[PDB]
Amino acid sequence: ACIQPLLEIDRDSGNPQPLVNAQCTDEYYRGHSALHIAIEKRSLQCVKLLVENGANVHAKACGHFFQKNQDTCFYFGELPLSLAACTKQWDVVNYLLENPHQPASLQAQDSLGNTVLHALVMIADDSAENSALVVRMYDGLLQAGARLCPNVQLEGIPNLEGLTPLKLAAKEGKIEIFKHILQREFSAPCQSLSRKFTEWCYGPVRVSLYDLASVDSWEENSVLEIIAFHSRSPHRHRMVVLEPLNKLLQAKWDRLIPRFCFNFLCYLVYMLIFTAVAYHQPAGNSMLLLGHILILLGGVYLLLGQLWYFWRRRLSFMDSYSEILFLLQALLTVLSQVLCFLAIEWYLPLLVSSLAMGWTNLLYYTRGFQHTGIYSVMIEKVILRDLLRFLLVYLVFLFGFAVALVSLSRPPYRSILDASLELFKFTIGMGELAFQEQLRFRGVVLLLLLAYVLLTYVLLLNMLIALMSETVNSVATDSWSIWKLQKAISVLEMENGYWWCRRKKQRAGVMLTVGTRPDGSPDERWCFRVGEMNWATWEQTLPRTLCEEPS
Amino acid sequence: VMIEKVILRDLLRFLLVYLVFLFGFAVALVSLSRPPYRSILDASLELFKFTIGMGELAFQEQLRFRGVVLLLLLAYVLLTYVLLLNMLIALMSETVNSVATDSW
Amino acid sequence: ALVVRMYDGLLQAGARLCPNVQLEGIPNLEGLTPLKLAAKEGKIEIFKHILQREFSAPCQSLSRKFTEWCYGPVRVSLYDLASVDSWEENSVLEIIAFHSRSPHRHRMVVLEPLNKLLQAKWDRLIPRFCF
Amino acid sequence: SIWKLQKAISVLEMENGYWWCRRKKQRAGVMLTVGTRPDGSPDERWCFRVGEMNWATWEQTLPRTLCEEPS
Numbered sequence: 045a046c047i048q049p050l051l052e053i054d055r056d057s058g059n060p061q062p063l064v065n066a067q068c069t070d071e072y073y074r075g076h077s078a079l080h081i082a083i084e085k086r087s088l089q090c091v092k093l094l095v096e097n098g099a100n101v102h103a104k105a106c107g108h109f110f111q112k113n114q115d116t117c118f119y120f121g122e123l124p125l126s127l128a129a130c131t132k133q134w135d136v137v138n139y140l141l142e143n144p145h146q147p148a149s150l151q152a153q154d155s156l157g158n159t160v161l162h163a164l165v166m167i168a169d170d171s172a173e174n175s176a177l178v179v180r181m182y183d184g185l186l187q188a189g190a191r192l193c194p195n196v197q198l199e200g201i202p203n204l205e206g207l208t209p210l211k212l213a214a215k216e217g218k219i220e221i222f223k224h225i226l227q228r229e230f231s232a233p234c235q236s237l238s239r240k241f242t243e244w245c246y247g248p249v250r251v252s253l254y255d256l257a258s259v260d261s262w263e264e265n266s267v268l269e270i271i272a273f274h275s276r277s278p279h280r281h282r283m284v285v286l287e288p289l290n291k292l293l294q295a296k297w298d299r300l301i302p303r304f305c306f307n308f309l310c311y312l313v314y315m316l317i318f319t320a321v322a323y324h325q326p327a328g329n330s331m332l333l334l335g336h337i338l339i340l341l342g343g344v345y346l347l348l349g350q351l352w353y354f355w356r357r358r359l360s361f362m363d364s365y366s367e368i369l370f371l372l373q374a375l376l377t378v379l380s381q382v383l384c385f386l387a388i389e390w391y392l393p394l395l396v397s398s399l400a401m402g403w404t405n406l407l408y409y410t411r412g413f414q415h416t417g418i419y420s421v422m423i424e425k426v427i428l429r430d431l432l433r434f435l436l437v438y439l440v441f442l443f444g445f446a447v448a449l450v451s452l453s454r455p456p457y458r459s460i461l462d463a464s465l466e467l468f469k470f471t472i473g474m475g476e477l478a479f480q481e482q483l484r485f486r487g488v489v490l491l492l493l494l495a496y497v498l499l500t501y502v503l504l505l506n507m508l509i510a511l512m513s514e515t516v517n518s519v520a521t522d523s524w525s526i527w528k529l530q531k532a533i534s535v536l537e538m539e540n541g542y543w544w545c546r547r548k549k550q551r552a553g554v555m556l557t558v559g560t561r562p563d564g565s566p567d568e569r570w571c572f573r574v575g576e577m578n579w580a581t582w583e584q585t586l587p588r589t590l591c592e593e594p595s
Numbered sequence: 596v597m598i599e600k601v602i603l604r605d606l607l608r609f610l611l612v613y614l615v616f617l618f619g620f621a622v623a624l625v626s627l628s629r630p631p632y633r634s635i636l637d638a639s640l641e642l643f644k645f646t647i648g649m650g651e652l653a654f655q656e657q658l659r660f661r662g663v664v665l666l667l668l669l670a671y672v673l674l675t676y677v678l679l680l681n682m683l684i685a686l687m688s689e690t691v692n693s694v695a696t697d698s699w
Numbered sequence: 700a701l702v703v704r705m706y707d708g709l710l711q712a713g714a715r716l717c718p719n720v721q722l723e724g725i726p727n728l729e730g731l732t733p734l735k736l737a738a739k740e741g742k743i744e745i746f747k748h749i750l751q752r753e754f755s756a757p758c759q760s761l762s763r764k765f766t767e768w769c770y771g772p773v774r775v776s777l778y779d780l781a782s783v784d785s786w787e788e789n790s791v792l793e794i795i796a797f798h799s800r801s802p803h804r805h806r807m808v809v810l811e812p813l814n815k816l817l818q819a820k821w822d823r824l825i826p827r828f829c830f
Numbered sequence: 831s832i833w834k835l836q837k838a839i840s841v842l843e844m845e846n847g848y849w850w851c852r853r854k855k856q857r858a859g860v861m862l863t864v865g866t867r868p869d870g871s872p873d874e875r876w877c878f879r880v881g882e883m884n885w886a887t888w889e890q891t892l893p894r895t896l897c898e899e900p901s
């Protein structure tokens with residue numbers, strides 16, 4: 045009851061700065077206002093009453109409680125309409141849009157650049173209860189924006205990074221709203237906000253068109269490039285399998301199979317030349333000088349290509365494993381030929397080390413096939429995860445027992461390294477244990493060898509059952525989707541061209557008139573066709589088609 | 596039935612990967628060792644003996660580059676243990692997620 | 700469900716009949732209140748009930764879980780640490796750790812007021828562990 | 831959870847102190863007034879703050895709060 049007479053009193057006194065537009069002053073709670081409180085407390089009547097007296101509906105609540113990544117904070121954006129949208133209050137959003145005094149604007153964006161659609165992207169994590177809220181409020185705000193301001197396209201407005209809500213949902217890793225936005229069908233009042241159409245439906249077969257406005261890799265800063273090279277989430281291999289993306293990447297791979305085979309044969313010919321030059325090193329001196337020159341050129345080529353990769357689209361151990369191994373082999377090759385040109389005589393271990401490393405890098409090209417590509421994915425995952433803690437524990441046990449046997453044996457076990465070598469021979473199955481008959485302390489040496497053998501059998505058995513428990517309690521589609529993500533990164537690399545000659549890339553998909561716009565010229569969109577077959581289509585209603593007869 | 600399905604499916608890609616690793620390391624040891632490892636075949640035979648459990652490794656004390664030979668042998672042993680471990684868990688991922696009526 | 704229903708009913712009835720006496724303070728001859736007994740004997744369901752307990756308008760002081768504020772979906776909930784804290788002698792944490800003999804000890808450490816408190820102790824004691 | 835129990839035993843042992851220096855232990859959590867008792871003075875309890883995020887809060891009934899603004 046006290047609100048209306050108090051505002052009448054504050055208007056009667058004649059202040060220069062009003063009471064109803066009041067901002068909190070603290071650093072933790074800066075810029076907060078009574079309108080944010082009224083929207084938080086779910087009271088529509090107090091919102092109407094504060095609006096009619098003249099509350100600022102674009103008040104930017106920029107406090108430290110209202111920022112993104114601080115602990116136990118609520119990031120809704122700054123504006124009141126973004127708060128009303130995030131807090132599931134539909135009638136408050138409706139009144140704030142359609143009031144006669146001081147209308148809230150959908151184009152209005154916060155200090156971080158985010159509009160209300162970006163905020164609805166940011167709040168989503170995972171549930172039915174969060175996801176249904178976010179998709180319903182997203183669709184409702186788009187339809188309300190088409191009603192109130194038809195010329196503005198609300199999904200075009202970017203953040204301060206330069207991202208639209210679709211690119212933001214791709215980067216932050218939100219699967220549910222990204223999957224909703226890519227395939228979105230609207231009805232007869234406003235159908236031009238759709239991204240999915242049906243071109244024709246002759247019986248059970250039909251042809252669905254998908255829009256590729258920001259999805260195609262032809263335009264810079266795509267969705268495909270953001271999933272491949274800019275997203276940091278562990279959701280990245282799941283987002284590649286979705287409905288317009290899988291067929292598009294399969295089409296690009298089927299276009300680019302010949303260049304993959306050509307790059308394979310070029311690398312194989314390089315490694316055979318490098319093998320013959322490292323074998324015949326020790327007339328023929330002319331052919332060996334030509335061979336050394338070709339190896340130096342190949343090393344400079346691979347080194348510059350990998351440096352251009354790391355400069356261009358990076359800034360990350362498991363994701364960039366292949367590029368690291370190619371970089372090490374290239375640097376060791378160039379360094380070894382520099383030392384052979386200067387004759388520093390240490391060129392031969394670097395030469396054979398880069399030779400072995402270059403032959404074992406031939407498993408990069410086994411990702412063209414599924415049957416062996418998933419196998420090399422598993423080799424990466426075994427080397428990076430499960431081998432290193434085993435080596436940690438094993439080297440602790442090994443050098444503890446080595447120093448014990450060196451110091452207890454006062455010709456057997458002369459030094460720490462020569463005792464480590466015999467204790468490592470026990471692991472292979474080549475090591476010798478016996479009753480020495482010359483040492484004074486024979487029984488203790490034999491007891492320590494028996495204990496070492498039992499402990500390392502325990503360690504190997506543990507490693508095996510740890511891998512079995514990790515693999516048997518795992519989803520089958522994960523290895524398949526990691527392989528698909530590797531192919532997607534590979535096809536986006538082959539599309540960009542070689543480093544010495546940048547390629548002129550082409551659009552994908554046909555250009556056709558999808559409909560009429562609200563104003564003037566008809567809607568003209570680049571679309572990608574996916575054929576579909578469904579046998580329950582006789583029950584549901586027939587959708588509107590762009591064409592009549594299948595072509 | 597299981598013998599045929601093990602031979603045709605699992606063993607051949609393992610042999611592919613293993614022979615790539617094997618002959619890469621064999622040519623490296625032949626060229627690095629300037630009486631040990633006299634030829635490509637005679638060094639491939641020793642690196643294959645390491646898989647049986649019969650293979651001899653030592654600090655050679657006559658070659659100039661002893662430590663690099665020892666380091667390459669240690670790396671070969673770890674990589675082949677990784678490959679056999681992978682083959683085993685790949686068969687277990689095929690066999691755990693299968694219907695029991697199918698072999699019958 | 701029987702034990703939690705009758706436990707709450709007895710607390711409300713004793714709060715009505717004899718208000719000054721607190722029933723949950725009276726110890727056994729072993730020295731234990733019912734929360735320490737539920738922690739010691741290994742009973743997960745009633746221990747989990749007592750640690751997060753909310754009562755209503757007639758008898759509100761019998762709760763052990765309070766909400767300090769709720770701004771939208773976020774809230775800060777206040778949990779009482781009367782016998783849970785390791786400052787006092789013969790705690791619930793000491794009884795779960797040492798004096799319990801059940802096979803259910805490791806399941807009782809993961810409960811909602813305990814997980815955050817033990818993480819907040821471990822993040823403070825990291826440097827002495829490295830030392 | 832077995833590993834969490836191991837860290838719990840470790841943090842109790844480090845909190846108790848060494849044998850040669852019996853360390854003085856400190857209370858955890860803030861002390862604040864929760865409400866009034868049925869007899870006389872208000873209740874002052876030592877409490878531990880746990881933050882939570884819940885999107886089912888709108889359909890349910892709103893609980894009693896001890897403070898007004900999030901501070």
Ligand SMILES: C=C(C)[C@]12C[C@@H](C)[C@@]34O[C@](Cc5ccccc5)(O[C@@H]1[C@@H]3C=C(COC(=O)Cc1ccc(O)c(OC)c1)C[C@]1(O)C(=O)C(C)=C[C@@H]41)O2
Nearest residue numbers: 365366369400401404405407408420421424427670673674
């Ligand atoms: C960067 C890492 C992690 C790495 C660099 C080198 C030292 C490496 O040893 C490891 C660790 C290691 C050490 C000792 C024995 C085995 C493995 O594994 C690779 C790394 C592991 C091997 C095995 O080859 C692979 O990893 C398969 C592979 C290669 C290239 C790829 O692009 C690839 O992608 C699928 C997979 C290659 C080596 O370079 C090699 O052949 C020699 C001489 C040593 C290998 O270190």
